[PDB]
Amino acid sequence: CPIDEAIDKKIKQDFNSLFPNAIKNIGLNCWTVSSRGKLASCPEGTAVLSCSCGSACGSWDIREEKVCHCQCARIDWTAARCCKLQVAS
Template identity: 75%
Template structure:
């Protein structure tokens, strides 16, 4: 009887010992935040390598050319050798010279790779 009681007490403290380390993991929050921070620092540059600036040209007859919604005009090109242009309403190229036969807008957007 006495032996059994000692055994049980021994087992009990063994259990407490097993519990101990897992409880010392706290503050869990901090540990996980640290881990998220570390992983983020390596994941982001890797993911950004797949994020590229993608640009293409949209041409139209006349002195106006528009980029599709969700894209940005980075430049315009004009017929008749003209280099004077402005961007209207954020998405429309307007060539200013006298007689313009065509206008092209350079349209860009960010593309997130897989």
Template identity: 75%
Template structure:
């Protein structure tokens, strides 16, 4: 219907197809650990908990309110949250 519009759409499509993969190469998952004394450890806002590690060799944990690691064993001296976020490169 509108040949110019269509031509430009096609070009946008083509350029996008090569620009996106190139840009995504600079987008990485970035993770780090936040440790606290006791049985709770929290990730900063804007990050996600992917795992928790507990003192006393304990492997039983749950995540509370999306951002807080809670270690469940009897006597826990420390708790660490593994916090991750997407980082868009330049």
């Protein structure tokens, strides 16, 4: 099957040379969303990677893989770290 045999090999070769380059060209795009009160939400299309809280509060949980909730009493602000991937080119 010589041609369809060889074309596929050239595709595999070409792909292998160019994939890792195309993977180094993508990055993590992260920003913070902060709100007064006990909740801060990441937008659709992003993941929540961490939370931060005012008033020294280290105790948080993430609700529905979207919303940072700070647990301590009378919290003044909540912040979520939101990330998605970005092609840098």
